[PDB]
């Protein structure tokens, strides 16, 4: 966790998110009040969990980490709720996955802090806020939508990670990794770790473009940052479904993966980067996809 930002000042990018959260956070600390409930939404690896921890640290309260799919029976939820101290942060990742039982219980503690529960701050995280129910969603006073990071922001994150790992890196090299990070800090840091391994084995003084290219070849990451499965999704649509449109369920079954993982984990970046598009009849690949994967444009 040595690479995990401990405060907003150490959290690169997400300017709109930071200013909104900072405003609410500072104000609450100044008044000694419990912070309004916060919902963090965006694809994986963007910093939702990191922001949840930062919120508690800034408030100087304790954070209770839990997972929606974990809270099965009301007993589990009720127990966690009663363990909360005034001002504590209850962090629920994949909160939209809470069953009606534990959800209705949680909702109750939000209306009047009684199911007596100590006033606390509910911080939920989900890949997409739309997955939450109408009731629970309207209970969040602050909703922070995180989008993919820019290449410039990612480069900054990469240089920071390199420094923390005691390794020198050239700007052009950091740029190359960032361009292949699929707009995600998690990916950018893992790629940096792997590039570090290559520097180690080739005994270099610092990471350059050559070292990065060698690493990307070993990792099978192309010039667009797409990995094996990313290409597998596009190739399946192209070859089996003639480019689409293909329904999410049909596509997921052909790939042997859950539909949720496909649409919530991999599709986001592919849509953002213009390789995929969604239509009422289903997903389709774009001309950019065909060209990039060197498939004859039908
Ligand atoms: N803005 C950022 N600056 C630096 N590192 C970041 C940032 N956002 C995320 N990370 C890093 O990426 C990893 C992924 O973050 P995490 O908060 O777990 O993502 P999420 O909960 O959205 O899946 C963490 O290692 C973290 O320390």
UniProtKB/Swiss-Prot annotation:
E.C. number(s) listed in UniProt: 3.6.4.-
Recorded consequence of changing residue 125 to C: 38% DNA-dependent ATPase activity
Record Gene3D superfamilies: 1.10.8.60, P-loop containing nucleotide triphosphate hydrolases (3.40.50.300), Winged helix-like DNA-binding domain superfamily/Winged helix DNA-binding domain (1.10.10.10)
Pfam families, sorted: AAA_lid_4, RuvB_C, RuvB_N
Binding of ATP, residues: 10-12, 46-47, 111-113, 139, 185
InterPro entries: AAA+_ATPase, AAA_lid_4, DNA_helicase_Holl-junc_RuvB, P-loop_NTPase, RuvB-like_N, RuvB_C, WH-like_DNA-bd_sf, WH_DNA-bd_sf
Localization of this protein: Cytoplasm
GO cellular component, one term: Holliday junction resolvase complex
Region (Head domain (RuvB-H)): 225-298
GO biological process entries: DNA recombination; DNA repair
Region Small ATPAse domain (RuvB-S), annotated ranges: 151-224
Temperature profile: Optimum temperature for ATPase activity is 80 degrees Celsius.
Keywords from the named record: ATP-binding, Cytoplasm, DNA damage, DNA recombination, DNA repair, DNA-binding, Hydrolase, Nucleotide-binding
Binding site for DNA: 278, 283
Reaction(s) this enzyme catalyzes, per UniProt: ATP + H2O = ADP + phosphate + H(+)
Predominant cellular place of this UniProt entry's protein: cytoplasm
UniProt-recorded Gene Ontology molecular function terms: ATP binding; ATP hydrolysis activity; four-way junction DNA binding; four-way junction helicase activity
Domain of life: Bacteria
Region (Large ATPase domain (RuvB-L)): 1-150
Residues noted as binding ADP in the record, renumbered to the chain: 3-4, 11-12, 45-50, 149, 185-186
Subunit structure as annotated in this protein's UniProt entry: Homohexamer. Forms an RuvA(8)-RuvB(12)-Holliday junction (HJ) complex. HJ DNA is sandwiched between 2 RuvA tetramers; dsDNA enters through RuvA and exits via RuvB. An RuvB hexamer assembles on each DNA strand where it exits the tetramer. Each RuvB hexamer is contacted by two RuvA subunits (via domain III) on 2 adjacent RuvB subunits; this complex drives branch migration. In the full resolvosome a probable DNA-RuvA(4)-RuvB(12)-RuvC(2) complex forms which resolves the HJ.
Main function: The RuvA-RuvB-RuvC complex processes Holliday junction (HJ) DNA during genetic recombination and DNA repair, while the RuvA-RuvB complex plays an important role in the rescue of blocked DNA replication forks via replication fork reversal (RFR). RuvA specifically binds to HJ cruciform DNA, conferring on it an open structure. The RuvB hexamer acts as an ATP-dependent pump, pulling dsDNA into and through the RuvAB complex. RuvB forms 2 homohexamers on either side of HJ DNA bound by 1 or 2 RuvA tetramers; 4 subunits per hexamer contact DNA at a time. Promotes Holliday junction (HJ) branch migration in conjunction with RuvA. Subunits can be free, ADP- or ATP-bound; nucleotide binding changes during the reaction cycle. Has a DNA-dependent ATPase activity; dsDNA and supercoiled DNA but not ssDNA stimulate activity.
Entry text on domains: Has 3 domains, the large (RuvB-L) and small ATPase (RuvB-S) domains and the C-terminal head (RuvB-H) domain. The head domain binds DNA, while the ATPase domains jointly bind ATP, ADP or are empty depending on the state of the subunit in the translocation cycle. During a single DNA translocation step the structure of each domain remains the same, but their relative positions change.
Family: Belongs to the RuvB family.
HAMAP family (UniProt xref): DNA_HJ_migration_RuvB (MF_00016)
Protein name: Holliday junction branch migration complex subunit RuvB
Organism: Thermotoga maritima (strain ATCC 43589 / DSM 3109 / JCM 10099 / NBRC 100826 / MSB8)
Taxonomic path: Bacteria, Thermotogati, Thermotogota, Thermotogae, Thermotogales
Primary gene name: ruvB
